[PDB]
Design a protein around this nucleic acid. Sequence first.
RNA 1: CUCCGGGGAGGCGGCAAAUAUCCUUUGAUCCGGAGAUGUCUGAAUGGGGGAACCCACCUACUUUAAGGUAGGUAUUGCAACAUGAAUACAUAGUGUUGCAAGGCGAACGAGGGGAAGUGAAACAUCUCAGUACCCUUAGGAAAAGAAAUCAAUUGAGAUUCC
RNA 2: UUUAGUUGCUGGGUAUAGACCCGAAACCAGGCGAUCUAUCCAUGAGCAGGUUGAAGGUUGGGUAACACUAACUGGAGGACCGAACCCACUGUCGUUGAAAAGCCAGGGGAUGACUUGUGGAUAGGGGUGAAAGGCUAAUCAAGCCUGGUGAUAGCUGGUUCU
RNA 3: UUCUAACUCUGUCCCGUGAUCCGGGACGAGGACCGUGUCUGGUGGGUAGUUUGACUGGGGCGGUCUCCUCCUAAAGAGUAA
Lengths: 60, 78, 44
Amino acid sequence: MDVILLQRIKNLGKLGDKVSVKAGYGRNFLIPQGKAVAATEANTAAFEARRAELEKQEAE
Amino acid sequence: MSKVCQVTGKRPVVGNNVSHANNKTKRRFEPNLHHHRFWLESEKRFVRLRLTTKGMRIIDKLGIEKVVADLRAQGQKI
Amino acid sequence: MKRTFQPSELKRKRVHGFRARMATKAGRQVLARRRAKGRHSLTV
RNA sequence: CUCCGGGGAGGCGGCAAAUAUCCUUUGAUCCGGAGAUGUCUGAAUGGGGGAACCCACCUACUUUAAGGUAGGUAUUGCAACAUGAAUACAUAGUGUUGCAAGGCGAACGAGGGGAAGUGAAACAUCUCAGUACCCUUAGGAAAAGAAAUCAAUUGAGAUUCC
RNA sequence: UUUAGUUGCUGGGUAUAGACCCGAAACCAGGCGAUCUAUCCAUGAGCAGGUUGAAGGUUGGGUAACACUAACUGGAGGACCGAACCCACUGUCGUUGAAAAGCCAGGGGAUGACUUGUGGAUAGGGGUGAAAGGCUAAUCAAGCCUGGUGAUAGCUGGUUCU
RNA sequence: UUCUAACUCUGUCCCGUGAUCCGGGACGAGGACCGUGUCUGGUGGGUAGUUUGACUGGGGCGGUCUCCUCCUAAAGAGUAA
Ligand SMILES: NCCC[C@H](N)CC(=O)NCCC[C@H](N)CC(=O)NCCC[C@H](N)CC(=O)N[C@@H]1[C@H](O)[C@@H](OC(N)=O)[C@@H](CO)O[C@H]1NC1=N[C@@H]2C(=O)NC[C@@H](O)[C@H]2N1
């Protein structure tokens, strides 16, 4: 899947970068636990337009 | 109560085995069905669905919440 | 010598009776056929 | 059994004669329409069961003894209300009320499955034939239907049937 | 280069249909049968009378002590003889029978791998079988019933006035 | 080599619940294996549909089955075992 990260991941990236992962990785680990969101156009717009400042605010 | 995909409605279909001598015998094609647990955040719970890999791809493309709402609209207990 | 018919009313009713026929769809089809033919007695 | 309308001298259904008691011009029997009553089994639905049987519970009235009268008590689906775990919020679960469904029956329709005898002068591809049969489910019909269709002088113009 | 067709009506022939009529052993589909019989499950019942004397036990002889040894008890057994009961080895009779498997005279088992009542389970290429292809309602190398079905038959029979 | 988050448990505890089914929750042991769908090679009398020639001094066994030459063949042609 194409996903947008919600946090730091060692080999993927961090804090809003769009990166393609294997479908099982996104479906079973990241998305259910909130570490990323599927990179739909609506999801990307909703993430970047508003919420991103607080997402950056949480350092740890 | 059957081998039916909850997302797509896929179910076994009939066909033929065709040998090299062209003998034909009845067979069925079965869907790639399995059970899968999906996290539903709006309801804070796992939902267990019997679905195909194509249904999983549909859920990947459309989001779990939209698919669950559509099944409820069709009248399924999810 | 012992012959094939050894009567028992309870067994007769439990095997061929009205409720036994009604218990399955094939028995209900039997009852439908006998009603269509017009039998005076439907079951044993 | 009651009412309304017709009809006008016989009548008390048939096998099935006789008999008695009788009814009827104060209009019978009979004919048409509308009402009243309508035991038990059967989807049978209060529980059960070897169909026409066995055993019950709850309300209201009634009786004094060991009963009566009327009503309610199935399951599933939907809606509302109430209640309510693991578990905090919830959800699952539970209950009440209201509404709906189930069963039967000719053929025709739509859909899910689907043979072999036979023919090929043998037989396996093929045929028989999507026939027989099984299953689900409508309507007075059903299905189809308004071109991502045909045609090939650039023309036709939705389905269905002959 | 042949120069009368065509449409009706009647008749002869051919083709597709059951195709002149009657007749298979079979094959397929859906139902009905374990009240007979096979095995199993649950709960009940039955076995006159008479023999034999296992293990074990007690007492007594005998030894330096064991050993060894006698008598009395005891009541085992797919134990023995033999009625009921369950079987079916021989012979006569019966064979349009008294009887679609028997009678009579003898015969085997008879406390056991025993016999038996009631009620259940297993269903047809399936069941069950101390195994005979046995049994599965007087039917079994694939039960019965109804459908495909008027199966097919290069075979046999029959085919009506002058 | 390690891990957990898909997935497995005919393991323990809790709840629905008066319940050795089932569902949900918490653990534990496993774990990207096992297992399932589509495709594909192998095996496959377990099961099923069928085939397994004719002549012939009966049938079987043996022999033969197409072509050329001579005789049988009766002075045209043809003529069987
Ligand atoms: N659940 C199913 C499991 C499937 C499993 N995996 C088996 C598999 O993978 N594929 C099965 C094949 C499916 C196909 N529809 C059957 C078919 O189309 N047959 C055609 C039969 C034609 C005719 N009627 C009879 C005939 O001439 N036959 C010959 C030949 O006799 C046969 O030899 C045997 N027979 O002994 C084989 C050689 O071995 O060649 C056949 N000729 C051919 N064979 C080829 C082929 O198939 N394609 C391409 C082309 O080459 C074909 N021409």
